[PDB]
Amino acid sequence: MEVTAKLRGAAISAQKARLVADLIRGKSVAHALNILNFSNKKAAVLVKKALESAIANAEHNNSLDVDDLKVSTIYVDEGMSLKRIMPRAKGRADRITKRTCHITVKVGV
Amino acid sequence: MKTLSAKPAEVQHDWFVVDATGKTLGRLATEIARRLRGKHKTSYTPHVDAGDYIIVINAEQVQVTGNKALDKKYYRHTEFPGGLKETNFEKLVAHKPEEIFERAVKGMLPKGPLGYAMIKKMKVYAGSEHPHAAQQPQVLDI
């Protein structure tokens, strides 16, 4: 039985969050929390928020002990982009996308 | 009834040893290529290697006719701007007869993975002795 947490609308592109998601896939939640605590990645903070949320969900809503929970599934999807204008030289204009992402974490016994 | 392919798991490779002393190079290489490809069997399949192993002994005693010992040129290119290199039949047969047999036979074989697998089964030795007595090759007199 997997317990899920969804961090929707995190202000970071999926390509960057996926590097952190790949680091903790299929690991103990203690090991994953250690890995996320000592990373200098901005995505580590958001993935830690989502993962500790999933652990809290498993304990409160499902009565599962944390000592054997495992990161049984994690993936990062794209979210709604923000479209902005950036002026360029000579009157040209470029379109900037501010990319967001949705993190899904599922912990399992 | 449909036509059956030889299964690679039931292909039985056999070992043969042929003596190259005093034989025409190309006229021996055609028979070697036919044996290596498996063209002499009724289970012959163009996408399967069902050929035999062929040991060539006394490879440095193979013969060419006419004036080819001096006129037959072997070329290489090192892929460097002026790197086309040339050797003789008689220089290369006194230095690397195995390269002579491999060049003669590889040109009479298919060019691809199966062809490389087929060329792996030709074992060429310049002397009278080979190390495959454990395989007990039979004397194929061509």
Binding site: - | T42, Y44, P46
Partner: protein, 117 residues
């Protein structure tokens, strides 16, 4: 009577893209590329219905040649002798016999030999 071409066009594109399952990359996802891939697969299959008969006949002939050379003949003389002996077995059956039954093929080679004499 304004006609919206949404359901029918979608249906046609879905048909073409279903005939493209297994192709690499855009060739299985993108309709413009998938449609050319599918038309070309069709032309290839038309041409290869013809090429298959040549290929299988050449296979039978190689196998008969091997079997006939195991019996002191060659494909040419064995076919000539079997045609001089009124035998009308075709090459597919002869190749099947050569591959699966060596004694019957030796018997056929004996017929061809006796006719060539």
């Amino acid at each position: 009577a304004r006609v919206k071409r949404g359901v029918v066009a979608h249906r046609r594109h879905k048909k073409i893209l279903a005939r493209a399952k297994g192709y690499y990359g855009a060739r299985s996802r993108v309709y413009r590329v998938a449609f050319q891939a599918v038309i070309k697969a069709g032309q290839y299959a038309y041409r290869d219905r013809r090429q298959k008969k040549r290929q299988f006949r050449a296979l039978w002939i190689a196998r008969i040649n091997a079997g006939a050379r195991q019996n002191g003949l060659s494909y040419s003389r064995m076919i000539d002798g079997l045609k001089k002996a009124q035998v009308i077995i075709d090459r597919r059956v002869l190749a099947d016999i050569a591959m699966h039954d060596a004694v019957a093929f030796a018997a056929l080679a004996e017929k061809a030999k006796g006719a060539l004499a």
